[PDB]
Every structure is written in C-alpha cells, then in structure tokens.
Design an enzyme around this catalytic site. Structure first.
Site, PDB file in Angstrom:
ATOM      1  N   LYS A  12       0.830  -1.196   0.000  1.00 16.80           N
ATOM      2  CA  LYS A  12       0.000   0.000   0.000  1.00 16.80           C
ATOM      3  C   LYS A  12       0.872   1.256   0.000  1.00 16.80           C
ATOM      4  CE  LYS A  12      -3.848  -2.227   2.448  1.00 16.80           C
ATOM      5  NZ  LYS A  12      -4.794  -2.090   3.588  1.00 16.80           N
ATOM      6  N   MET A  13       0.513   2.209  -0.853  1.00 14.85           N
ATOM      7  CA  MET A  13       1.290   3.421  -1.065  1.00 14.85           C
ATOM      8  C   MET A  13       0.486   4.634  -0.597  1.00 14.85           C
ATOM      9  SD  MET A  13       2.908   4.664  -4.653  1.00 14.85           S
ATOM     10  CE  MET A  13       3.999   6.082  -4.793  1.00 14.85           C
ATOM     11  N   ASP A  44       9.173  11.529  -1.852  1.00  7.77           N
ATOM     12  CA  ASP A  44       9.627  11.333  -3.223  1.00  7.77           C
ATOM     13  C   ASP A  44      11.020  11.930  -3.390  1.00  7.77           C
ATOM     14  OD1 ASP A  44       8.920  10.519  -6.101  1.00  7.77           O
ATOM     15  OD2 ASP A  44       9.736  12.571  -6.311  1.00  7.77           O
ATOM     16  N   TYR A  49      18.426  14.850  -7.709  1.00  8.62           N
ATOM     17  CA  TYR A  49      18.060  16.025  -6.914  1.00  8.62           C
ATOM     18  C   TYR A  49      19.210  16.504  -6.014  1.00  8.62           C
ATOM     19  CZ  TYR A  49      13.300  14.691  -8.381  1.00  8.62           C
ATOM     20  OH  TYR A  49      12.190  14.296  -9.105  1.00  8.62           O
ATOM     21  N   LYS A  78      14.678   7.176  -7.734  1.00  5.88           N
ATOM     22  CA  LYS A  78      14.650   7.048  -9.186  1.00  5.88           C
ATOM     23  C   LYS A  78      16.057   6.883  -9.731  1.00  5.88           C
ATOM     24  CE  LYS A  78      10.907  10.508  -8.985  1.00  5.88           C
ATOM     25  NZ  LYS A  78      11.491  11.501  -8.020  1.00  5.88           N
ATOM     26  N   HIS A 111      13.680   7.016 -14.062  1.00 11.23           N
ATOM     27  CA  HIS A 111      13.311   8.425 -13.924  1.00 11.23           C
ATOM     28  C   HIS A 111      12.747   9.009 -15.229  1.00 11.23           C
ATOM     29  CE1 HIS A 111      14.458  12.157 -11.342  1.00 11.23           C
ATOM     30  NE2 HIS A 111      13.352  12.390 -12.034  1.00 11.23           N
TER      31      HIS A 111
HETATM   32  N1  LIG Z   1       9.576  12.195 -12.054  1.00 14.97           N
HETATM   33  C1  LIG Z   1       9.926  13.404 -12.530  1.00 14.97           C
HETATM   34  O1  LIG Z   1      10.441  13.569 -13.636  1.00 14.97           O
HETATM   35  C2  LIG Z   1       9.604  14.602 -11.682  1.00 14.97           C
HETATM   36  C3  LIG Z   1       9.617  15.866 -12.262  1.00 14.97           C
HETATM   37  C4  LIG Z   1       9.247  16.964 -11.509  1.00 14.97           C
HETATM   38  C5  LIG Z   1       8.877  16.787 -10.186  1.00 14.97           C
HETATM   39  N2  LIG Z   1       8.922  15.557  -9.625  1.00 14.97           N
HETATM   40  C6  LIG Z   1       8.584  15.346  -8.165  1.00 14.97           C
HETATM   41  O2  LIG Z   1       7.379  16.041  -7.867  1.00 14.97           O
HETATM   42  C7  LIG Z   1       7.616  16.960  -6.790  1.00 14.97           C
HETATM   43  C8  LIG Z   1       6.636  18.135  -6.891  1.00 14.97           C
HETATM   44  O3  LIG Z   1       6.827  18.860  -8.116  1.00 14.97           O
HETATM   45  P1  LIG Z   1       7.636  20.240  -8.202  1.00 14.97           P
HETATM   46  O4  LIG Z   1       8.687  20.303  -7.140  1.00 14.97           O
HETATM   47  O5  LIG Z   1       8.084  20.357  -9.627  1.00 14.97           O
HETATM   48  O6  LIG Z   1       6.568  21.419  -7.978  1.00 14.97           O
HETATM   49  P2  LIG Z   1       5.189  21.612  -7.153  1.00 14.97           P
HETATM   50  O7  LIG Z   1       5.083  20.603  -5.989  1.00 14.97           O
HETATM   51  O8  LIG Z   1       4.102  21.668  -8.164  1.00 14.97           O
HETATM   52  O9  LIG Z   1       5.389  23.105  -6.617  1.00 14.97           O
HETATM   53  C9  LIG Z   1       6.438  23.391  -5.681  1.00 14.97           C
HETATM   54  C10 LIG Z   1       6.390  24.903  -5.439  1.00 14.97           C
HETATM   55  O10 LIG Z   1       5.140  25.247  -4.820  1.00 14.97           O
HETATM   56  C11 LIG Z   1       5.351  25.982  -3.614  1.00 14.97           C
HETATM   57  N3  LIG Z   1       4.315  25.600  -2.665  1.00 14.97           N
HETATM   58  C12 LIG Z   1       4.144  24.419  -2.074  1.00 14.97           C
HETATM   59  N4  LIG Z   1       3.120  24.404  -1.315  1.00 14.97           N
HETATM   60  C13 LIG Z   1       2.540  25.623  -1.382  1.00 14.97           C
HETATM   61  C14 LIG Z   1       1.417  26.169  -0.759  1.00 14.97           C
HETATM   62  N5  LIG Z   1       0.644  25.478   0.101  1.00 14.97           N
HETATM   63  N6  LIG Z   1       1.140  27.458  -1.065  1.00 14.97           N
HETATM   64  C15 LIG Z   1       1.906  28.172  -1.923  1.00 14.97           C
HETATM   65  N7  LIG Z   1       2.994  27.680  -2.537  1.00 14.97           N
HETATM   66  C16 LIG Z   1       3.302  26.398  -2.255  1.00 14.97           C
HETATM   67  C17 LIG Z   1       6.762  25.575  -3.158  1.00 14.97           C
HETATM   68  O11 LIG Z   1       7.343  26.627  -2.382  1.00 14.97           O
HETATM   69  P3  LIG Z   1       8.221  26.385  -1.071  1.00 14.97           P
HETATM   70  O12 LIG Z   1       9.003  25.028  -1.232  1.00 14.97           O
HETATM   71  O13 LIG Z   1       9.126  27.582  -1.030  1.00 14.97           O
HETATM   72  O14 LIG Z   1       7.251  26.343   0.158  1.00 14.97           O
HETATM   73  C18 LIG Z   1       7.483  25.440  -4.507  1.00 14.97           C
HETATM   74  O15 LIG Z   1       7.934  26.693  -5.020  1.00 14.97           O
HETATM   75  C19 LIG Z   1       9.094  17.321  -6.982  1.00 14.97           C
HETATM   76  O16 LIG Z   1       9.654  17.978  -5.846  1.00 14.97           O
HETATM   77  C20 LIG Z   1       9.658  15.915  -7.214  1.00 14.97           C
HETATM   78  O17 LIG Z   1       9.698  15.218  -5.976  1.00 14.97           O
HETATM   79  C21 LIG Z   1       9.264  14.473 -10.341  1.00 14.97           C
HETATM   80  O1  LIG Z   2      13.630  14.969 -13.615  1.00 16.50           O
HETATM   81  C1  LIG Z   2      13.230  15.563 -12.618  1.00 16.50           C
HETATM   82  O2  LIG Z   2      12.550  14.953 -11.656  1.00 16.50           O
HETATM   83  C2  LIG Z   2      13.494  17.050 -12.429  1.00 16.50           C
HETATM   84  C3  LIG Z   2      14.984  17.328 -12.676  1.00 16.50           C
HETATM   85  C4  LIG Z   2      15.845  17.450 -11.588  1.00 16.50           C
HETATM   86  C5  LIG Z   2      17.215  17.648 -11.757  1.00 16.50           C
HETATM   87  C6  LIG Z   2      17.756  17.720 -13.037  1.00 16.50           C
HETATM   88  C7  LIG Z   2      16.907  17.589 -14.129  1.00 16.50           C
HETATM   89  C8  LIG Z   2      15.535  17.403 -13.963  1.00 16.50           C
HETATM   90  C9  LIG Z   2      14.722  17.293 -15.223  1.00 16.50           C
HETATM   91  C10 LIG Z   2      13.657  17.999 -15.600  1.00 16.50           C
HETATM   92  C11 LIG Z   2      13.331  17.480 -16.930  1.00 16.50           C
HETATM   93  C12 LIG Z   2      14.277  16.557 -17.149  1.00 16.50           C
HETATM   94  C13 LIG Z   2      14.455  15.617 -18.314  1.00 16.50           C
HETATM   95  C14 LIG Z   2      15.352  14.548 -18.247  1.00 16.50           C
HETATM   96  C15 LIG Z   2      15.479  13.639 -19.303  1.00 16.50           C
HETATM   97  C16 LIG Z   2      14.695  13.799 -20.439  1.00 16.50           C
HETATM   98  C17 LIG Z   2      13.789  14.867 -20.520  1.00 16.50           C
HETATM   99  N1  LIG Z   2      13.006  15.019 -21.633  1.00 16.50           N
HETATM  100  O3  LIG Z   2      12.382  16.060 -21.776  1.00 16.50           O
HETATM  101  O4  LIG Z   2      12.939  14.102 -22.442  1.00 16.50           O
HETATM  102  C18 LIG Z   2      13.673  15.764 -19.452  1.00 16.50           C
HETATM  103  O5  LIG Z   2      15.130  16.421 -16.137  1.00 16.50           O
END
Ligand SMILES: NC(=O)c1ccc[n+]([C@@H]2O[C@H](COP(=O)([O-])OP(=O)(O)OC[C@H]3O[C@@H](n4cnc5c(N)ncnc54)[C@H](OP(=O)(O)O)[C@@H]3O)[C@@H](O)[C@H]2O)c1
Ligand SMILES: O=C(O)Cc1ccccc1-c1ccc(-c2cccc([N+](=O)[O-])c2)o1
Length: 316
Positions: A12-13, A44, A49, A78, A111
């Site tokens: 469970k997640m 996460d 990062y 990731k 990732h």
């Molecule tokens: N798998 C992937 O490729 C990938 C890509 C992008 C993101 N992620 C994951 O998803 C997570 C979330 O996405 P994200 O970091 O891109 O952006 P997000 O969670 O959409 O937004 C983060 C921003 O929102 C602000 N914030 C948070 N809560 C708030 C609230 N209640 N009111 C006003 N502002 C608020 C934060 O400010 P403060 O921190 O200054 O409070 C920060 O500037 C990432 O941290 C990462 O763990 C994964």
């Molecule tokens: O990946 C994250 O979770 C956010 C992030 C964190 C640190 C460095 C690069 C990052 C991104 C943001 C986009 C990105 C890419 C990484 C690989 C490939 C592509 N793409 O557009 O195909 C995008 O990589």
C-alpha cells in the site's frame, strides 16, 4: 478517502507524499522532519536532486526517535538517465540506499525513458548541446530493475515520464517478470493527462502526479507563465470549500485515484498541504478543474528532444 492505494505488488502506497526536487540541502532535513511529524509517510526522492544524503538524515532521525517505524514509511527514488546500462543499475540503487541510509526502497522508478552516456555529468552534451544518448534497450534496463526486487533492494519498481507506447513496450516485454507498479508523470489542471491516466489505470498501474502546483519554482519559469496558484477560478473553488488553492490542487488528483507529491520546504505549507483529507470536491468541481486543461507541460528539456526515446512527441 483512504490514505493509501494498493499497488500491483501487494503493498500500500500513501496517496500524499512530499516532493524534494529543488529543496535546498540546508533546508530539506528540517522539511522532511516536519513532514513526518505532521503525518507524511511518503517521500519522493531522486539521485539527480543532489539532496538524498540530507533527506536521509531526516528519515534516520525520525526512525531513531521512534516517531515512525520503517514499515510505515514509503520511500521512493529514481534511477537517473546516465545509469540505464544494465550493469550500472544496481550500483546506482545502492548509492541511493547509502545516501538515504536505508536497506530497501519501497519504490524505485526509471526516472525518464531516455538513457544517456554514463559519466559524472547528469546531462552529457555534444559540442552543439544535444544530449548524448545511451544505446541501451529500455527492456534491458527493465530486466535490471527486476533484479533489484529479486535481490531485496527494492519492494516495487516503476517508471516515470513514459508515454503510453513506452508503457506498452514494458507491458509487452518478452519474459516480463514484474509489471511496473507506478508511472509518475506531470499532472495538474493545465495538463490533465486523461488519455495516459486512463491507459495506465486500465492496466493496473498507479499514476503519481508530479508538479501538482505547476512547479512555480522550476528554474526556467518565466514571469508571464500561467500560474495555477493564482488562477482566480481555482481560488473561487477553494473559497467555496474554505481551503487554499494549493489544497484544492492537491485534493484534485487524489479524487482521480492518483498519488500526489507536492514539494515544499516551508513548514507552514508542508502542514497545509497535508490537511486535505477533510473535504470533498464535487464531481462538478472535478469536471470544471479538468476543463482547464491547456496541454501546458512545464517539465521537459530542449536538449533531449532528438533523443529517440523522447517521450513527448507522441500525443500521449
Ligand atoms: N519524475 C519526474 O520527472 C519529476 C519531475 C518533476 C517533479 N517531480 C517530483 O514532484 C515533486 C513536486 O513537483 P515540483 O517540485 O516540480 O513542484 P510543485 O510541488 O508543483 O510546486 C512546488 C512549489 O510550490 C510551492 N508551494 C508548495 N506548497 C505551497 C502552498 N501550500 N502554497 C503556496 N505555494 C506552495 C513551493 O514553495 P516552497 O518550497 O518555497 O514552500 C514550490 O515553489 C518534486 O519535488 C519531485 O519530488 C518528479
Ligand atoms: O527529472 C526531474 O525529476 C526534475 C529534474 C531534476 C534535476 C535535473 C533535471 C531534472 C529534469 C527535468 C526534466 C528533465 C528531463 C530529463 C530527461 C529527459 C527529458 N526530456 O524532456 O525528455 C527531461 O530532467
């Protein structure tokens, strides 16, 4: 609204987790401590990062303090793009485990579907700025991920930023041993992802919504860009419910049967963001929020657009 969702590995997640991309290393330890103190049980993470050591300090302290048991936490990380080579996958996972100070991950994701040349640089470039690809077949990367389950390093494996054809490739892999448990993708009212979400859910893959607030702190944000947190229509829905716009933005994916991972390093916001289990958006609210889709994708990189596995040329 139950607090956890059942994965296809039987675990469970928690449907709400704390994001850590961009959380500064001098702030993220306290952010994670606060999060655990106020109820978060899912963090996460990612090697890319550059803050897993500091996240790990927080997790370890809360385990040592007996605030929470390891079995009650759900820690996600990731595999970065430069580690897709089958022979590099285990070492990448082990480095993450070492930094997080854990003996297993609950979930380990590929990732991005794009493999890059291995080396010190997260984005190896040619002299013209194109990312330098790996030739490694993702199905081979997947087999390497499966080995991590069998060796006890991770309880579940999944994918991130895979389009439906890429998900299908994994599902159709000859000799597939473990299905992806999760596909983690960008999702918010301006990029609602209906098609990909329905595809994944139809296959029993749980979807995690990243950047649910639109990632306003992403490094390439421009002043004129759309802002979910400032959208007056979303503000109005929030006001109706006596909640903040962020709380609506978090509750929205929860009601679509998604997991959601808002990032904050602000203690008051970390707590605010968790207070989303005490109200319900109507189906009319949900459809209205869905209607705001503009196919506005914030998380993609120009340097990767010629990689053969770039995920975002396809419609979904
Ligand atoms: N798998 C992937 O490729 C990938 C890509 C992008 C993101 N992620 C994951 O998803 C997570 C979330 O996405 P994200 O970091 O891109 O952006 P997000 O969670 O959409 O937004 C983060 C921003 O929102 C602000 N914030 C948070 N809560 C708030 C609230 N209640 N009111 C006003 N502002 C608020 C934060 O400010 P403060 O921190 O200054 O409070 C920060 O500037 C990432 O941290 C990462 O763990 C994964
Ligand atoms: O990946 C994250 O979770 C956010 C992030 C964190 C640190 C460095 C690069 C990052 C991104 C943001 C986009 C990105 C890419 C990484 C690989 C490939 C592509 N793409 O557009 O195909 C995008 O990589």
């Amino acid at each position: 609204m139950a607090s956890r969702i059942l994965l296809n590995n039987g675990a469970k997640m928690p449907i709400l987790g704390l994001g850590t991309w961009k959380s500064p290393p001098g702030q993220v330890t306290e952010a994670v401590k606060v999060a655990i103190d106020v109820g978060y049980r899912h963090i996460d993470c990612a090697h890319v990062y550059q803050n897993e050591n500091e996240v790990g300090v927080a997790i370890q302290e809360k385990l040592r303090e007996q605030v929470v048991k390891r079995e009650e936490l759900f820690i996600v990380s990731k595999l970065w793009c430069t580690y897709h080579e089958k022979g590099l996958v285990k070492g990448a996972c082990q480095k993450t485990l070492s930094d997080l100070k854990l003996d297993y991950l609950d979930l380990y994701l590929i990732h991005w579907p794009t493999g890059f040349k291995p080396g010190k640089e997260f984005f190896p470039l040619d002299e013209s700025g194109n990312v330098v690809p790996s030739d490694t077949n993702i199905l081979d990367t997947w087999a390497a991920m499966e080995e991590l389950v069998d060796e006890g390093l991770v309880k579940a494996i999944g994918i991130s930023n895979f389009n439906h054809l890429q998900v299908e490739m994994i599902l159709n892999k000859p000799g597939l041993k473990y299905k992806p448990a999760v596909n983690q993708i960008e999702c918010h009212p301006y990029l609602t992802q209906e098609k990909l979400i329905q595809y994944c859910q139809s296959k029993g893959i749980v979807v995690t919504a990243y950047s649910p607030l639109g990632s306003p702190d992403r490094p390439w944000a421009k002043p004129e860009d759309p802002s979910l947190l400032e959208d007056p229509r979303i503000k109005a829905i929030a006001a109706k419910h006596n909640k903040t716009t962020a709380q609506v933005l978090i509750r929205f994916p929860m009601q679509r049967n998604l997991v959601v991972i808002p990032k904050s390093v602000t203690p008051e916001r970390i707590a605010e963001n968790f207070k989303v289990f005490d109200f319900e958006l109507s189906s009319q609210d949900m459809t209205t929020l869905l209607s705001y889709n503009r196919n506005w994708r914030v998380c993609a990189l120009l340097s990767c657009t010629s990689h053969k596995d770039y995920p975002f040329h396809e419609e979904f």
